[PDB]
């Protein structure tokens, strides 16, 4: 039920191991980062609306802080998510390599020698 929390060499509360620095960081124009900034902007607009302020123009510093905080947290969230997916792929490939008897290579036949049943549509 808990796949990756018992992995050997896992520091408890790091959120970003050192090996994650071997991966390319997400670009600052990442569409996911842009969506995080959009979420921050929506939060700022809702903050203006709830407090009964001019929605689009009331507190510009507050909207800027909202967007900046959302983008700042989203960058590190994206880094961690990318690192976790990279770890999953690394472990899967290593396991496949270390167990050749469970993932055999069987010769593939061409469609000229494979007999497929024909089901007429009528």
């Amino acid at each position: 039920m808990t796949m990756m929390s018992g992995r050997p060499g896992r520091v408890p509360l790091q959120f970003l191991p050192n090996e994650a620095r071997s991966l390319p960081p997400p670009k600052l124009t990442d569409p996911r980062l842009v969506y995080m900034g959009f979420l921050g902007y929506c939060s700022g607009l809702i903050d203006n609306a709830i407090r009964r302020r001019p929605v689009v123009s009331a507190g510009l510093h507050r909207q800027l802080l909202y967007v900046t905080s959302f983008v700042f947290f989203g960058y590190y969230l994206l880094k961690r998510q990318d690192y976790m997916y990279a770890l999953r792929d690394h472990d899967m490939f290593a396991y496949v390599k270390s167990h050749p008897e469970d993932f055999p290579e069987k010769d593939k036949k061409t469609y000229g020698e494979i007999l497929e049943e024909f089901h007429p549509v009528r």
């Binding site: 990756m4 809702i46 709830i50 961690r80 998510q81």
Partner: protein, 347 residues
Amino acid sequence: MNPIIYTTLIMTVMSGTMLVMISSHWLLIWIGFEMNLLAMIPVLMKNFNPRATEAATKYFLTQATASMMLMMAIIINLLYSGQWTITKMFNPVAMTMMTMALAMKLGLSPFHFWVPEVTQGISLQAGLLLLTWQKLAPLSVLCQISQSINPNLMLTMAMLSILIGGWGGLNQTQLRKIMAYSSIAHMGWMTAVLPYNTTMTILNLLIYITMTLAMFMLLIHSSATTTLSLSHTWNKMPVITSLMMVTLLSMGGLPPLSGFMPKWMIIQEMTKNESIIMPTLMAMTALLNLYFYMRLAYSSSLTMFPSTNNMKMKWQFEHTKQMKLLPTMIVLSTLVLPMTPALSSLN
């Protein structure tokens, strides 16, 4: 209650929960549960009235019985293996006792009866705390011992929780009981996927907590505890009712809102384990929760109910206290579906 005393009590509740979270010894987990209950009883009784006293008494009785069963399970496990570490229980009888105790703590069916009563008997702040923070410790303990779960009992309780949450919510006009039945159904959803993927359980808990916080904060801002009181909000704060309708739609699991993400994920995870009948039944049953959410939306924001004359006076005054995390909570409750893959950061 003194503000310093209240702060100390809230900190004691949170520190008991964290003691449960960080402990490696069964005795310390039990101590954390005991401390959490001890500090949590007064918080339910901050505003004194007979209903609050009754809710506190019922909560104390339920949680004390659960704690005693918890300790009995621990002691049996120690008897059949001289171990105190919370890794995996060595006796099926102790496992059954622990599962039942944690279900009673969480309020899963058929131990659900106390949840609507206690939620109705306390204020909206106490209800928020009870339905958000009180779920962390038993769920963390269940996640740690997931590989020892007997799937049949856990899945039976989860399915019962979903069904009973829907059916009980169908009949309510008080908003606190509606929230309590929603909590029961969501807890059933959380525990259905626990024996398969604890990351899905954590994700479901996070989404549910965000939506519950948004709901309770919107209910505190528009100080309503019944359907008809909430029918008056549109004539004073229409934006609140609109946001509440969108949040209610999200709580119903409708795409493309955030509430769809957990169930979806849970469903697909279950299909990886050749579980097909149960997820289908769970979704068809969650249709009921959607139905009474839509009833509340009909009464609150999509139609305009008659109002009173005195409401004109309320037009002249603003809210002196503002909740700083309500807009962020609403946005997280609605627009986080495109960020679904981020769940890999949770494992």
